[PDB]
Structure formats: structure tokens, C-alpha cells
Write a protein that binds this ligand. Structure first.
Ligand SMILES: [Cl-]
Ligand SMILES: [Cl-]
Ligand SMILES: [Cl-]
Ligand SMILES: [Cl-]
Ligand SMILES: [Mg+2]
Ligand SMILES: [Mg+2]
Length: 383
């Protein structure tokens, strides 16, 4: 027990970003060595070393064949699965078929090596463990890891297996939406007074809606829906195209083939989106965007909303589906919990609060951190 943490860390092993939390005297989300409270679920292999997290994502463009990401899209799946065959056409790294399983093949230290999805995820989980250890000052042996509610038994086992590989005793695999509810203490009393709770989780690349029944300490997923491939980055993309159009119109320049110019302009758009969650108008500037020309525009909240009209509206569909499927009316819903950074967008909150006739949404916990937070809460209950 000497020099070992007696608790269990909570890990949100996300598709694109991961987050780790612990609950000593209170629940804390842990920052990594670059001071970030989420860490890219990225592993890069180079002629000299392996990078995990921020450094891996930051060199992805320079090292695309050997920078691995989206392993959560493979884990516990089969090579000839339909999502897989499809996902593979979109990745710059090689995925091969070994005994019918997907396996990632890369160059590492000037040799060809292959990794299962569980092995890649284990490397991310090891990174999360190490991040937690650095802040705790102790070794971590126990964890609670979260997975999407639609994960099947193979996907769940493969995720536990990843944990084992990373030197963690995985006490429980819990559902992402359930973690978020636990974060808000919903059902914490373990009282027999029941609740129905809708989790609205709009991630950067994922949109998941889940209906929970909670009573007596038992969290039951009644129904689940979403858009796997719609997310916050899609809002950025619409603003990016709007800005590209403006720039080309004023200057005659097309930045489509300049990766750096595209990157800087998407950064401007991401920043502009965030500003517009707090205020209603902003300038948008990029100095010397292309061929000597400065980019300057402005954007109102109203215009931002119009540019994403259809997308925003589409977010109510899965809320309706989940109720329809569970045979539960919107009036029976006790809490609506917001997860994912994109839920900070005022319009998204408004469409949702209006659908529930002015109901206030649970949002006091950072939406990017809520899943990890509840995983940490569950970890403390188990230890
Ligand atoms: Cl995810
Ligand atoms: Cl993610
Ligand atoms: Cl630059
Ligand atoms: Cl700039
Ligand atoms: Mg998430
Ligand atoms: Mg300037």
C-alpha cells in the first residue's frame, strides 16, 4: 500500500479526447504536462520515440501514416464490419485484417509494427494514469472507465482489456451518460423516489442522447440515440467556409491548398464561435493569412446561428426519438444534463430548454469534464 493511491481514478476514454479525474477530499480534473485538462486520444510513432496525447496530435500533419487516432472506432469490432470498412477509407494510417480483426500497422523505430485497438487505447490509458500519478504523488492501480451506452459486450470487454494492459485494475466499466448523471449526484441518496434524466451529449465529433431511469441506486438506460458522426467541429466547419468565401471574394485568393492558412482560419472560427457563446458580436482577424493579405471580418451571434440553422435544429431529433422509443413523455423528464463543449452554444441551450417548456438545464459542471467527474465519483464509491 506504500506509495499507492487507495482510490480509483475516473477515466473518460474519448474518441478524440480523454479526461481523468480523482476524488480525494473533492473531485478534481487533472491537467497534463502541457497544462491541459483533456488530452488527445492520439498515439504517434517516429523513427526515435512514441508520443502520446498533445505532442502526438501536434505532429500528426507531419507524420500522418504513423499517427494513430480514433481507435475507439475499432475497439471490440471486426475487420469486415460496416462502420470499420467505411472508417478505414478516412484514415491516413494503415489498418489490416488479422484473423478477421482490425489491426493498426505503422513504422516505429524504423520497423513495421502492428497494434490492436486495445493496445493503442491501453497506451492512451497509460498516459491518463501517468497524468493522474504526477498530480497525486502516488502510484495508481485502480480505475473506473467510461464507454458509450450503445457499446456492446465485445466493445466493453475490449475496453477493460485495454485497462488491464495499461496496468489498471478496472473496477467497473460505466456508461458515459450514467457517469454524467453521477457527476450531478442524481440518485446519490440511493432513495426509492425515482427519476428520469435525459443526457444531451454533443461532443466535437459525436452526438449522443440517452434516457436514464434512476431509482434505489440503479441507473437504467431506457433508450439511446444520436448522430455518431455529427459534432461541434461541424459548427466550426460552416463558419470556416463562410470565412473562406469572404476572403476569396475580397482578395481573389483561395487558401484551400495551404494547410497552414486553413489551420489558422479554422482556429479563428473556433475562437469566434466561443466568443459568441458569451457575447453577441466579434471581429475575426488573421494577420497575413495568405499572399500578404490580412483577413478581417465580423460575425454576430445571429449570423453564427443562421450559418448553422439546419444542424442546430437537427439536434432535437434524437431527443424526440429517445422519448418516443422509451414511451416516456417530455413532462416525465426530471433533469436534462448537458455534456460536450458545444452545449455551451446559447442557441443549443435555448432550443433544448424551449422543447422542455422552459426547463433549466444541468450545466454547472464543465461539459467536457462531466463524464470524467462522474467516473471519479463512482471510483470513490467503489473504494
Ligand atoms: Cl466519445
Ligand atoms: Cl471525444
Ligand atoms: Cl503563420
Ligand atoms: Cl493572427
Ligand atoms: Mg464525451
Ligand atoms: Mg494584424
Amino acid at each position: 500500500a506504500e506509495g499507492v493511491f487507495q482510490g480509483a481514478i475516473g477515466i473518460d476514454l474519448g474518441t478524440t479526447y480523454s479526461c481523468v479525474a480523482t476524488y480525494e477530499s473533492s473531485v478534481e480534473i487533472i491537467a497534463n504536462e502541457q497544462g491541459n485538462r483533456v488530452t488527445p486520444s492520439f498515439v504517434a510513432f517516429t523513427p526515435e520515440e512514441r508520443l502520446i496525447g498533445d505532442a502526438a496530435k501536434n505532429q500528426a500533419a507531419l507524420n500522418p501514416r504513423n499517427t494513430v487516432f480514433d481507435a475507439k472506432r475499432l475497439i471490440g469490432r471486426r475487420f469486415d464490419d460496416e462502420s470499420v470498412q467505411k472508417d478505414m477509407k478516412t484514415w491516413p494510417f494503415k489498418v489490416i485484417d488479422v484473423d478477421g480483426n482490425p489491426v493498426i500497422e505503422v513504422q516505429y523505430l524504423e520497423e513495421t509494427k502492428t497494434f490492436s485497438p486495445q493496445e493503442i487505447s491501453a497506451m492512451v490509458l497509460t498516459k491518463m494514469k501517468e497524468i493522474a500519478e504526477a498530480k497525486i504523488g502516488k502510484k495508481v492501480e485502480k480505475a473506473v472507465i467510461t464507454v458509450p451506452a450503445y457499446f456492446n459486450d465485445a466493445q466493453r470487454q475490449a475496453t477493460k482489456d485495454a485497462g488491464a494492459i495499461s496496468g489498471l485494475n478496472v473496477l467497473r466499466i460505466i456508461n458515459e451518460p450514467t457517469a454524467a448523471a453521477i457527476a450531478y449526484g442524481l440518485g446519490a441518496g440511493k432513495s426509492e423516489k425515482e427519476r428520469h434524466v435525459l443526457i444531451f451529449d454533443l461532443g466535437g465529433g459525436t452526438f449522443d442522447v440517452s434516457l436514464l431511469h434512476i431509482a434505489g441506486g440503479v441507473y437504467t438506460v431506457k433508450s439511446t440515440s444520436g448522430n455518431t458522426h455529427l459534432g461541434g467541429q461541424d459548427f466550426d466547419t460552416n463558419l470556416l467556409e463562410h470565412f473562406k468565401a469572404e476572403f476569396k471574394k475580397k482578395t481573389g485568393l483561395d487558401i484551400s491548398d495551404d494547410a497552414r492558412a486553413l489551420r489558422r482560419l479554422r482556429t479563428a472560427a473556433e475562437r469566434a464561435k466561443r466568443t459568441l457563446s458569451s457575447v453577441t458580436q466579434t471581429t475575426v482577424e488573421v494577420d497575413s493569412l495568405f499572399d500578404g493579405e490580412d483577413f478581417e471580418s465580423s460575425l454576430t451571434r445571429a449570423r453564427f446561428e443562421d450559418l448553422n440553422a439546419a444542424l442546430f435544429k437537427s439536434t432535437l431529433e434524437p431527443v424526440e426519438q429517445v422519448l418516443k422509443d422509451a414511451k416516456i413523455s417530455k413532462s416525465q423528464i426530471d433533469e436534462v444534463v448537458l455534456v460536450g463543449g458545444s452545449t455551451r452554444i446559447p442557441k443549443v441551450q435555448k432550443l433544448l430548454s424551449d422543447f422542455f417548456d422552459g426547463k433549466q438545464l444541468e450545466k454547472s459542471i464543465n461539459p467536457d469534464e462531466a463524464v470524467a467527474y462522474g467516473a471519479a465519483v463512482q471510483g470513490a464509491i467503489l473504494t
